[PDB]
Design a protein around this ligand. Structure first.
Ligand SMILES: [Mg+2]
Ligand SMILES: [Mg+2]
Ligand SMILES: [Zn+2]
Ligand SMILES: [Zn+2]
Ligand SMILES: [Zn+2]
Ligand SMILES: [Zn+2]
Ligand SMILES: [Zn+2]
Ligand SMILES: [Zn+2]
Lengths: 44, 137, 65, 114, 88, 351, 127, 142, 138, 100, 48, 56
RNA sequence: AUCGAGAGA
DNA sequence: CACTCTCGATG
């Protein structure tokens, strides 16, 4: 799947057997991207 | 509202009186051994992994992690990890279940290598708690 | 966080009056009481609702993520 | 977590009827009617309107527990006067007064500015 | 002149991060120089993990004085920072 | 439940306390404990014929357990035994033994004062064992010379885990002494015929507690027994092979130490016998000492099923003898109701 | 939550229907009003997201309904959120007919002043 | 209708504390036991039981409710069935069930055997005392 | 408490040297019978000898601390009736700030050393953001 | 307290107590908080990254030895002299994802 | 007596003196998990 | 549980929300307010024991 | 599960 | 000598 770096606006798509680090950055803090399947909210 | 108890206006509660965000972080890590034995993060199938959890794994991705945004509740599996110890059932389950009493939404998943080069993960789940009968003020 | 959309107690809309309140404080150089009065916040629950609010989101926006 | 749905305050449950008319065993010619999915709004009004009927000996409503949206209404009328007729007359009286109130408010609203 | 007041705050001291880390580091560094003495008499190869893992241990467990349970500092000298509220 | 047994169900009426005679100890045992190795033997997930025998109780969720089978849930615990190279002292009796040595002179094995004395006739008249022993001990420890055998009875004092003499007493010597006190003298100071004898206080061979007492997730008791067996094999090795004068004694004191601390770890002796993780180790004594102990923590009170706990609140519309129970709790907690013609319909609907 | 509290035009609400009563799946045009919200931080300064930015998507078919009330002087309405520089808010809102007894967000009225017998001539109050 | 007494009414700064019911509420009906004592585990998160402590026991004694006390201490916790030798009265019995072979090496007992119901913690205590060179001999007759 | 602090610790040696070079008789050269009214001086629990005319010494020390020449965290206790002078440079001592009251006011009486001008400078520093707490201490 | 420990006490602990028979310990050098990764690349460690990656916010000690050398890592108190955040402005703290 | 304060030593001297426990004590039937001779269990129920 | 009135048999009334609800006049023997106090509930598992509860 | 720490009545 | 939740480092 795809991930996103922490301290820069990037969009990594490196799956397994890759992980760290980032593309044109150097830091190893990677967050996972939001799901495609939309979640509803009872606006209450 | 007797004996140090209070009555709270439900209408104001609806408008957001004393509402709160509650975040919770779960932390997991892939273990390492001398003979290059390593645990892996994945979504295990019931035919290839021992023990397993009673909860479902259907919310896990290929990397054995939930995508932030997905609603989780009950004993759902948040982190999917296996540990190996031909032959059927070659893996032991080491997956992490969402808190049995708690529920909420996966707020943010963090994947990072350790100082010893160990791929470890912190999953943060968010839950909005609304003031209820029995809440301490 | 951000200015509450409606007053908890009675239900009067107050989420549209925050910027107007700030302007009434800095532009016309009014005091909080008169500013809250001109915004039609007579009941002290709404008066509180705006006066008591802390706009923390303005600090939240200081982060890049 | 254990909180009931909100619509359970006004939406009738499975099998729950609006009114449950039961014969009162205490005093003769008395009745206790269980109003479901209603509160003080209807109870106090109907009870107060039942005290206007001079052929009504007793009339009292109570909400046995604030958790559940329901109230009991006990009515005792004079002999030769069915209590259901007292409830009906009370309701119709209410409706008429509210119709007149609405009409008057409307004619009073048309004569206003700003 | 009457008895001395043993509850007098003026005759008491508060050891902060400084003195505590000082005692701990004196211990760990003496252990280190002892180990280095041993490596020296065995004959640059200095085990730095002693001070590191020592300090880390005492700061992590709250048990001041490396790994010896005979310590009376088991009352948790270092604690997890309470961050429920700013005032907290 | 469990399973049908041909044995009649009876209720415990009496509890006869006593000591474990080495004869009965080895007769009761079902497995000799020679090897100090725990389970694995040369890369093998099994059990060596030393410690943790399958005879003591299988531990791998099997269907077999020492011929009798019955899995590992039905099977209680089958004790073993280990023979010591030389006899040692039981810590909890260190005082008592030290008193018995002061009630009877050495070599021979007879009481100091008899019916010939005036005060001894009054001391032995007490029927209560504890009071009798307490009364005789005070009126017998002052005697130096002595049935004949007029040997000058030495002044015995306590030192660590051994006993001295003033005119060092070996454990074997005290065994030989208590072996010759005979029956008639036992009744005179509390002890029983076939239940508890002074010749059984000292530990010739000690029983080995089954795996259900020391489970594996290894337990501290397993490590301590491994230490005892280690000191035992060490002592035997120093005895059979080269046997120096001032070397085997240290091994004897070591075995004595480990056996003493295996039961009681909180003694006046400063060596608390730590472990590999720096832990002071959990003795059998500490397991029983409340309030977290076995008695006050698992017998006088214990966690139970069909229980609930929650934040309480007042309710003006509940009766005095009522209790508001949350729906979730009501769903959780259950009651076993037998199907009767009276309630078969209701129970059917509930199901 | 903030979106839920937003006041919408409920003039012709009596010819709209409850979703629970409507014979459709989930919601439709006869029972609900769908309105979108697409906001994105453009300027270097803070980009405010108001209730005016809500855009009706469903078919109102004549009924005066769904339109978010703007009593604001500048014509903005309720301040829903604030975006930075690269922050984005993309969402869809389904508004349904409701009772304030179910949730206070469906409250058409604010405070109702109520007073009888100003001189306490009835003595309903012991001062 | 008006209220007779007038009410002290006004703004006051209140705070919400960390203790909320849904984080406290706990109920267990037959759950996971421990391994050593075979008693209900400790903790709400581990679906554990609640300690029927000494003082609660004292209360039930004061009430006179004996059967309830026994039920709390057996069926609702660790109820275990053990075999006792008719001679020495220890848990030396090797009960080969399904063959009815109740052996006992040491006294040669096969026909004079007994069966009792005690807590598993009691069995543990007795075993530990036996491992401490003490014989808690259990006789079933006066 | 909000303003309480802890002594970090400092070198007592220069204070010792100062004392000896300001009329403190060495303890090894002390004869009690020929000087009974001699105030004995202590430093960190150590008796470094006695000192006649202790008032001048105390005013000098206090002036040095208030100037900054002696570290402000160093405590100086003058016990008159007990005729002792205890100086502590010990670390871990919990202290707190206090307004200094002096009677050097000619056209007045005993007043606070700090004046409204100082406060004006402080609030000037507050509004601008050069006159801080350290300047109050110095 | 911590600043007192670093700027003075440490040197006293190393110099005034240790000498072997020879190797005499000289000055002590305390770096800025850094991490030696498994990658091998040693780099600057900021507090947020330390808390996120379960690392230890510590600096290295280097002593001059006679007849230089790393002797271990000292945990650094935040907002201390050797801490990056002490010299940091508000905007810096915001960029460093540290709350001002 | 072992269910209070001095626990283990009481059992020690009990085993050393070979004491007989009547098991008609409350805590003793509490340990044995049997219906103690308490109130409800202060008698027997038979059939006639 | 200081005295016998700390453990008393109550009649169950299943109610919504997540709190053990009790009558005010039962506060005194339990010694309990409602400022965060928690209570325990034990369910009998046979007829004779629930008889013990209901009758004693 | 074994030891310390915070806190709830 | 006098019931809970919890956290967090340890074998
Ligand atoms: Mg109270
Ligand atoms: Mg309370
Ligand atoms: Zn990057
Ligand atoms: Zn208001
Ligand atoms: Zn078996
Ligand atoms: Zn003799
Ligand atoms: Zn529809
Ligand atoms: Zn037998």
């Amino acid at each position: 799947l795809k991930y996103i770096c922490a301290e820069c606006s990037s969009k990594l798509s490196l799956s397994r057997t890759d992980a760290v680090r980032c593309k044109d950055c150097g830091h190893r803090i990677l967050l996972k991207a939001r799901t495609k399947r939309l979640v509803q909210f009872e606006a209450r | 509202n007797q004996e140090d108890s209070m009555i709270m206006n439900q209408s104001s509660i609806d408008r957001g009186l004393f509402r709160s965000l509650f975040f919770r972080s779960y932390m997991d890590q892939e273990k390492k051994y001398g003979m290059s034995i390593t645990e892996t993060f994945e979504k295990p199938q019931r035919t290839n992994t021992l023990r397993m959890k009673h909860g479902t794994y259907d919310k896990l991705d290929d990397d054995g992690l939930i995508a932030p945004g997905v609603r989780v509740s009950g004993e759902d599996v948040i982190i999917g990890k296996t540990t190996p110890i031909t032959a059927y059932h070659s893996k032991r389950d080491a997956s992490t279940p969402l808190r049995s009493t708690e529920n909420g939404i996966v707020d943010q998943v963090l994947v990072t290598t350790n100082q010893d080069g160990l791929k470890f993960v912190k999953v943060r789940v968010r839950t909005t708690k609304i003031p209820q009968i029995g809440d301490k003020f | 966080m951000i200015v509450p959309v409606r007053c908890f107690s009675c239900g009067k809309v107050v989420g549209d009056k925050w910027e107007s309140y700030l302007n009434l404080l800095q532009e016309d150089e009014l005091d909080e009481g008169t500013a809250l009065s001109r915004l039609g916040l007579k009941r002290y629950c709404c008066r509180r609702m705006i006066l008591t609010h802390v706009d923390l989101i303005e600090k939240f926006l200081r982060y890049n993520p | 977590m254990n909180a009931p749905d909100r619509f359970e305050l006004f939406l009738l449950g499975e099998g729950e009827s609006k009114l449950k008319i039961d014969p009162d065993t205490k005093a003769p010619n008395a009745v206790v009617i269980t109003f479901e999915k209603e509160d003080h709004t209807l109870g106090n009004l109907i009870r107060a309107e039942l005290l206007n009927d001079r052929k009504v000996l007793f009339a009292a409503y109570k909400v046995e527990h604030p958790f559940f949206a329901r109230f009991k209404l006990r009515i005792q009328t004079t002999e030769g006067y069915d209590p259901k007729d007292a409830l009906k007359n009370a309701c119709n009286s209410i409706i008429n007064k509210l119709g007149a109130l609405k009409t008057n408010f409307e004619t009073e609203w048309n004569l206003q500015t700003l | 002149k009457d008895q001395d007041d043993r509850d007098h705050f003026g005759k008491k001291r508060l050891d902060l991060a400084g003195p505590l880390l000082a005692q701990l580091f004196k211990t760990l560094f003496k252990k280190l120089t002892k180990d280095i003495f041993r490596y020296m008499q065995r004959t640059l190869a200095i085990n730095a993990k002693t001070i590191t893992s020592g300090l880390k241990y005492a700061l992590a467990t709250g048990n001041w004085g490396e790994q010896k349970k005979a310590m009376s500092s088991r009352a948790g000298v270092s604690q997890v920072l309470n961050r429920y509220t700013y005032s907290s | 439940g469990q399973q049908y047994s041909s044995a009649p169900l009876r209720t415990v009426k009496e509890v006869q306390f006593g000591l474990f005679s080495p004869e009965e100890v080895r007769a009761i045992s079902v497995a000799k404990i020679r090897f100090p190795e725990t389970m694995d033997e040369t890369q093998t997930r099994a059990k060596i014929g030393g410690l943790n025998d399958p005879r003591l109780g299988s531990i791998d969720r099997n269907l077999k357990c020492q011929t009798c089978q019955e899995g590992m849930n039905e099977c209680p615990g089958h004790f073993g035994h280990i023979d010591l190279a030389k006899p040692v002292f039981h810590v909890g009796f260190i005082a008592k033994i030290k008193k018995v040595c002061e009630c009877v002179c050495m070599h021979c094995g007879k009481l100091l004062l008899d019916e010939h004395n005036e005060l001894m006739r009054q001391a032995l008249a007490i029927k209560d064992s504890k009071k009798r022993f307490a009364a005789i001990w005070t009126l017998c420890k002052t005697k130096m010379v002595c049935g004949g055998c007029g040997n000058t009875q030495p002044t015995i004092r306590k030192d660590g885990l051994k006993l001295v003499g003033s005119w060092v007493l070996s454990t074997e010597e005290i065994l030989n002494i208590f072996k010759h006190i005979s029956v008639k003298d036992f009744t005179s100071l509390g002890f029983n015929e076939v239940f508890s004898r002074p010749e059984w206080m000292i530990l010739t061979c000690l029983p080995v507690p089954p795996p259900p007492v020391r489970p594996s997730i290894e337990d501290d008791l397993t490590f301590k027994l491994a230490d005892i067996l280690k000191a035992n094999i060490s002592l035997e090795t120093l005895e059979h092979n080269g046997a120096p004068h001032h070397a085997i004694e240290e091994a004897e004191s070591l075995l004595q130490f480990h056996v003493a601390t295996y039961m009681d770890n909180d003694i006046a002796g400063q060596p608390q016998a730590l472990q590999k993780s720096g832990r002071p180790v959990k003795s059998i004594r500490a397991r029983l000492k409340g309030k977290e102990g076995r008695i006050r923590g698992n017998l006088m009170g214990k966690r139970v099923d069909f229980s609930a706990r929650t934040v309480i609140s007042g309710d003006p519309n509940l009766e005095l003898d009522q209790v508001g129970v949350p729906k979730s709790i009501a769903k959780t907690l259950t009651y076993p109701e037998v199907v009767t013609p009276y309630n078969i319909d209701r129970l059917t609907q509930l199901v | 939550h903030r979106l839920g509290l937003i006041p919408l035009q409920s003039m012709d609400i009596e010819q709209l229907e409850y979703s629970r009563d409507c014979f459709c799946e989930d919601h439709c045009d006869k029972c609900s009003v769908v309105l979108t919200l697409q906001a994105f931080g453009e300027s270097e300064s803070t980009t405010n997201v108001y209730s005016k930015d809500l855009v009706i998507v469903s078919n109102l078919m004549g009924r005066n309904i769904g339109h978010p009330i703007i009593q604001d002087k500048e014509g903005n309405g309720v301040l829903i959120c604030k975006l930075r520089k690269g922050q984005e808010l993309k969402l869809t809102c389904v508004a349904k007919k409701g009772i304030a007894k179910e949730h206070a967000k469906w409250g058409p009225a604010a405070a109702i002043e109520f007073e009888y017998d100003p001189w306490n001539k009835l003595k309903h109050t012991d001062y | 209708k008006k209220l007779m007494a007038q009410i002290f009414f006004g703004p006051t700064y209140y705070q919400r504390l960390r203790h909320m019911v849904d984080d406290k509420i706990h109920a267990r009906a037959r759950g996971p036991m421990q391994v050593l004592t075979r008693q209900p585990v400790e903790g709400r998160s581990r679906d554990g039981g609640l300690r029927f402590g000494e003082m609660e026991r004292d209360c039930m004694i004061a009430h006179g409710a004996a059967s309830f006390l026994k039920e709390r201490l057996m069926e609702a916790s660790d109820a275990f069935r053990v075999h006792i030798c008719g001679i020495c009265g220890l848990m030396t019995v090797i009960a080969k069930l399904n063959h009815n072979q109740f052996e006992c090496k040491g006294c040669d007992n096969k026909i004079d055997i007994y069966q009792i119901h005690i807590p598993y913690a009691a069995k543990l205590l007795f075993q530990e005392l036996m491992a401490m060179n003490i014989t808690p001999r259990l006789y079933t007759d006066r | 408490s909000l303003m309480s602090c802890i002594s970090v610790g400092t070198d007592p040696m220069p204070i010792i040297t100062f004392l000896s070079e300001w009329g403190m008789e060495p303890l090894e050269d002390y004869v009690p019978h020929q000087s009974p009214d001699a105030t004995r001086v202590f430093v960190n629990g150590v008796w470094h000898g006695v000192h006649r005319n202790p008032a001048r010494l105390m005013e000098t020390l206090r002036t040095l601390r208030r100037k900054g020449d002696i570290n402000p965290e160093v405590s100086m206790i003058r016990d008159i009736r007990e005729k002792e002078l205890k100086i502590f440079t010990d670390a871990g001592r919990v202290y707190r700030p206090l307004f200094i009251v002096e009677d050097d006011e000619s056209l007045g009486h005993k007043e606070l050393k700090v004046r409204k001008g100082h406060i004006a400078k402080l609030m000037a520093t507050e509004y601008q953001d050069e006159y801080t707490w350290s300047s109050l201490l110095n | 307290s911590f600043n007192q420990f670093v700027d003075y006490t440490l040197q006293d602990i190393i110099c005034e107590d240790s000498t072997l028979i020879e190797i005499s310990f000289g000055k002590i050098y305390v770096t800025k908080p850094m991490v030696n990764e498994s990658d091998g690349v040693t780099h600057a460690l900021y507090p947020q990254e330390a808390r996120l990656r379960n690392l230890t916010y510590s600096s290295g000690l280097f002593v001059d030895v006679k007849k230089k050398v790393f002797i271990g890592r000292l945990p650094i108190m935040l907002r201390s002299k050797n801490c990056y955040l002490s010299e940091a402005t508000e905007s810096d703290l915001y960029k460093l994802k540290e709350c001002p | 007596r072992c269910s209070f304060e001095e626990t283990v030593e009481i059992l020690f001297e009990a085993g050393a003196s070979a004491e007989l426990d009547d098991c008609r004590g409350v805590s003793e039937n509490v340990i044995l998990g049997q219906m103690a001779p308490i109130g409800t269990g202060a008698f027997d129920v038979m059939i006639d | 549980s200081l005295h016998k009135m700390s453990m008393m048999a109550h009649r169950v009334k299943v109610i919504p929300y997540s709190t053990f609800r009790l009558n005010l006049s039962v506060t005194s023997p339990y010694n309990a307010d409602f400022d965060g106090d928690e209570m325990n509930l034990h369910v009998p598992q046979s007829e004779e024991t629930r008889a013990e509860l209901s009758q004693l």
